[PDB]
Design a protein around this ligand. Structure first.
Ligand code: QMF
Length: 167
């Protein structure tokens, strides 16, 4: 038993809710919140910009130190940093950005990072400003993640479309 509430169960291990991931993280304080990161951990907009703003820019300060030490992530890769006031940990995962021409097959590799964590709060990777089809992103998530994932979808219209079209 865990503290996530109001989710629709899609599969044995995947759950989904129309929710603002920032507000969900603050309420649940999950062990892991997933950030829709870029390779530079520049959290300017989308989910990343919102998460970082909620931490009063502490996420960005920590991230800049990480990059200065380690260099950029790979597309499809991840790193674990602090969750600040939102979670124990933040798993920063880089899905391919279609608006940069990155290979959509890297989406599966991105979701594989979720399997290193028993339970996660996450957005749909490569959705929103990353330019991928969220329905496809949900399918890859369901077909790749084996651990327990609670998906927060900000847009109500999109959430209803994801549920109604789910096979
Ligand atoms: O900006 C904020 N949040 C916020 C911003 C952006 C996103 C986001 O990229 N989602 C991904 C997404 C969907 C959705 O979630 O709609 S459908 C879909 C389909 C394919 C791929 C992805 C995808 C998520 C959350 N919050 C600040 C105002 C307080």
């Amino acid at each position: 038993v865990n503290s996530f509430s109001g989710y629709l169960k899609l599969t044995d291990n995947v759950y989904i809710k129309n929710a603002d991931i920032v507000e969900e993280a603050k309420k649940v304080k999950p062990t892991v919140v997933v950030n829709a990161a870029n390779v530079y951990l520049k959290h300017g907009g989308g989910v990343a910009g919102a998460l970082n703003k909620a931490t009063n820019n502490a996420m960005q300060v920590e991230s800049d130190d990480y990059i200065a030490t380690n260099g950029p992530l790979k597309v499809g890769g991840s790193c674990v940093l602090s969750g600040h006031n939102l979670a124990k940990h933040c798993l920063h995962v880089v899905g391919p950005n279609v608006n940069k021409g990155e290979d959509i097959q890297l989406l599966k590799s991105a979701y594989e990072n979720f399997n290193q964590h028993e339970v996660l709060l996450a957005p749909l990777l490569s959705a929103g400003i990353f330019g991928a089809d969220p329905i496809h992103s949900l399918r890859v998530c369901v077909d790749t993640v084996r651990t327990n994932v609670y998906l927060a979808v900000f847009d109500k219209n999109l959430y209803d479309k994801l549920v109604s079209s789910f096979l």
